[PDB]
């Protein structure tokens, strides 16, 4: 929460990156956030919130990936799916 | 990091079973390896429980054999799981070596001389264990090869003498076969583990002879899983053996106890060593028969120099492949002749299928090797 | 309605692993009285059961 | 011999793949297998044959003549 | 001659015609080979590894290219051949060092 909170007010500096987040904000979000409405969702979340999401987008589901160079000793792809959920190891 | 990577146990674990680069083109007929090593772990387990229940007294032998398969509880399921997976372990041997040649696999030396170090070892493992339930044709075939040890002149004599114990096959022998058979599978599994040292230290083969050295594949899930498969049939394979008719390949004639006078006319072993007997008496001489096996073994020594293709397999050589399946055909033919007695038209192509065999591994493939190696623009 | 049973009983291994340790008793239960009705079935007559309730 | 990694240099290729998950495991089975079978069959038994039939032959003529000899005496 | 005819019928019927490799694809590869591979230009070596990994897929599979893809006899382009010759020259010429 704190690295989120520096550096989103850093991401927050000039005028160019900013205005580049008010228009890519009134696009998507049909509005541009405030600031303290992102301090407000950063305290809405504690360890609960992040392990439940950890347990939906990350935990057992299928990934896909792009390798490039010398990848041959990059493992085959049910490696990575059967290292992608635990039994512990 | 892990404890994979840097424990001294998993690292061996680890370059033997799980970032073991197998090749991506293995069919069917590479599973018989781990197929092996199973059918030898069982056999060793169920000869195990046999060994809990056994008394090697000559005159209670057969007694003892008898209160196994009635009184000692499952005693008849773990003895028929001992004898008939002793035959699918020849099966799946001979399956394993068939797989060994004819994919051109015998172009390395010392796996190839392991595998028949380990050869010799399983047959006469299983030749012990043959002669120890002490019923007639176990008695009398002990005597036959006995005497087939007792062929060389000035060498052996002393040392049939010396295997006697006396003057036959006495209760000494049959201790000393029992002892032999219960040690010699584990000078098996050593050998085993030599014969895999050797292979992962070069590296596997695959169906088309090409250096698979671009597609690697790991071990860990996918042969893995491909050999429990395999696992899973080779049991159902025996348990339909051994729960439907459990008599299809043993002798009727073993069930009695050892009359040391009878030679009931219906001598043979089993099966598995017919052809290799058959060789012996379609051939017209004592010491020549004899030599003629261990040479029989021997020509699998020599086979990997002569070896003058200048490809590695035989997928892409048919004629020399029409010449190995006549080598199958004949193999089986030697079988069946080993499977009934001694008769004229037996006698004739008895002669005609051991001349053939040996005609053919010895001189036809350089022959049809060279053809193929001139055939080719080379 | 695969999902469903899925959110339900595989997801945390070791509760997978507890659950089909009770299917597999149910298993046991199911199968053992499937094998015996099937072989008395097919042995109607025959078997000890029949002739010592004659006895 | 040994693990991955040092085996062999490779440029120019691309390699795709797919996840278990997402395909059937069956995908036209018995409509493409069953060609596929017939046609590794009729690729290979005039070389699997020509041993087997001669040696089915040989063993009824052996036949006939050990029971010929067992018909008379 | 007829010997012709019998060099294009089994060239035919050799099997590795079918899964798209040349007359250079299935060689043995004793220490003489691995120097013959060696000495290769890169783009040749390319062709040659990808017709390798394209066979390995094939064989896995157990699946044959249609005949569209084929090689056919007319057209079996063969370069190992020279690379072999002069290896094959040179352990000849070690052996004959040793033998003089
Ligand atoms: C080291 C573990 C083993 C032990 C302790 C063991 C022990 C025994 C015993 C006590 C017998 C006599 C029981 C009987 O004959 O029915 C026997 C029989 C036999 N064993 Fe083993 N055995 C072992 C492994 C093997 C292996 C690896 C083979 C080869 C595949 C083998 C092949 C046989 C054969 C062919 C018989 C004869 C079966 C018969 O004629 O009734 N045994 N073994
Ligand atoms: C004693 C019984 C035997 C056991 C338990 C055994 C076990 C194995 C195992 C576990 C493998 C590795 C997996 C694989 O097959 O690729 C293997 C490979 C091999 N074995 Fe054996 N083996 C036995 C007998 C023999 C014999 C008699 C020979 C012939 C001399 C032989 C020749 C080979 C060869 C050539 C390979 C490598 C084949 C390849 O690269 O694909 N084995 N064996």
Redesign the interface.
């Given at each position: 929460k704190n690295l989120l909170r520096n550096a989103l007010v850093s991401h927050l500096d000039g005028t160019t990156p900013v205005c580049e987040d008010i228009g890519r904000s009134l696009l998507t979000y049909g509005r541009r956030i405030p600031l303290a409405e992102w301090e407000s969702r950063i305290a809405e979340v504690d360890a609960r919130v992040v392990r439940e999401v950890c347990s939906k987008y990350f935990?057992?589901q299928?990934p896909a990936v792009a390798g490039f160079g010398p990848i041959?000793?990059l493992?085959?792809?049910?490696?990575i799916?059967?290292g992608m959920?635990?039994?512990?190891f | 990091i892990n404890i994979r990577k840097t424990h001294p146990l998993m690292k061996i674990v680890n370059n033997a079973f799980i970032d073991l680069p197998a090749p991506s083109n293995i069919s069917s007929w590479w599973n018989f390896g781990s197929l092996l090593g199973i059918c030898l772990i069982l056999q060793i387990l169920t000869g195990l429980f046999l060994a809990m229940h056994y008394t090697p007294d000559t005159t209670t032998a057969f007694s003892s054999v008898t209160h196994i398969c009635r009184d000692v509880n499952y005693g008849w399921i773990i003895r028929y799981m001992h004898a008939n997976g002793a035959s699918m372990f020849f099966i799946c041997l001979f399956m394993h070596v068939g797989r060994g040649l004819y994919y051109g696999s015998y172009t390395f030396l010392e796996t190839w001389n392991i595998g028949v170090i380990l050869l010799f070892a399983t047959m006469a493992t299983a030749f012990m264990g043959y002669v120890l339930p002490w019923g007639q044709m176990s008695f009398w075939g002990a005597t036959v090869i006995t005497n087939l040890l007792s062929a060389i002149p000035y060498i052996g004599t002393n040392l049939v003498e010396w295997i006697w114990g006396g003057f036959s096959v006495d209760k000494a022998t049959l201790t000393r076969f029992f002892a032999f058979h219960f040690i010699f599978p584990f000078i098996i599994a050593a050998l085993a583990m030599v014969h895999l040292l050797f292979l992962h230290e070069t590296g596997s083969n695959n169906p088309t002879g090409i250096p698979s050295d671009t597609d690697k594949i790991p071990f860990h899930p996918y042969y893995t899983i491909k050999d429990i498969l395999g696992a899973i049939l080779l049991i159902l394979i025996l348990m339909l053996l051994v729960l439907f008719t459990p008599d299809l390949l043993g002798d009727p004639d073993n069930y009695t106890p050892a009359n040391p006078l009878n030679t009931p006319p219906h001598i043979k072993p089993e099966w598995y060593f017919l052809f290799a007997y058959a060789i012996l008496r379609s051939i017209p001489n004592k010491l020549g028969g004899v030599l003629a096996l261990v040479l029989s073994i021997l020509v699998l020594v020599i086979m990997p120099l002569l070896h003058t293709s200048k490809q590695r397999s035989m997928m892409f050589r048919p004629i020399s492949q029409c010449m190995f399946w006549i080598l199958v055909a004949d193999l089986l033919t030697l079988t069946w002749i080993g499977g009934q007695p001694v008769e004229h038209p037996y006698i004739i192509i008895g002669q005609l299928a051991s001349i053939m065999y040996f005609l053919i591994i010895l001189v036809m493939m350089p022959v049809a090797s060279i053809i193929e190696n001139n055939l080719l623009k080379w | 309605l695969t999902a469903r049973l899925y959110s339900l009983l595989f997801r945390r291994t070791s509760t997978f692993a507890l659950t089909i340790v009770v299917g597999a008793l149910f298993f046991e239960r199911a199968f053992d009285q499937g094998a015996d009705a099937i072989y008395e079935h097919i042995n109607e007559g025959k078997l000890w059961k029949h002739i010592k309730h004659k006895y | 011999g040994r693990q991955f990694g040092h085996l062999t240099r490779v440029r120019h290729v691309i390699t795709y793949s797919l996840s278990p998950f997402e395909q059937r495991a069956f995908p036209h089975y018995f409509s493409k297998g069953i060609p596929n079978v017939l046609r590794r069959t009729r690729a290979c038994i005039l070389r699997v044959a020509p041993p087997f039939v001669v040696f089915y032959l040989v063993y009824t003529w052996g036949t006939q003549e050990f029971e010929k000899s067992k018909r008379k005496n | 001659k007829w010997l012709e005819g019998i060099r294009k019928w089994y060239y035919n019927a050799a099997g590795f015609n079918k899964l798209g490799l040349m007359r250079d694809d299935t060689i043995h590869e004793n220490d003489d080979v691995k120097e013959a591979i060696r000495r290769l230009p890169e783009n040749l070596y390319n062709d040659r590894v990808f017709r390798i990994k394209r066979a390995l897929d094939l064989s896995m599979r157990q699946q044959i290219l249609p005949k569209e893809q084929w090689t056919k006899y007319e057209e079996d382009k063969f370069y190992l051949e020279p690379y072999l010759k002069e290896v094959i020259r040179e352990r000849k010429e070690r052996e004959e060092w040793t033998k003089k």
């Open positions: 935990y057992d299928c041959e000793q493992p085959d792809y049910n490696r799916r059967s959920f635990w039994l512990r | - | - | - | -």
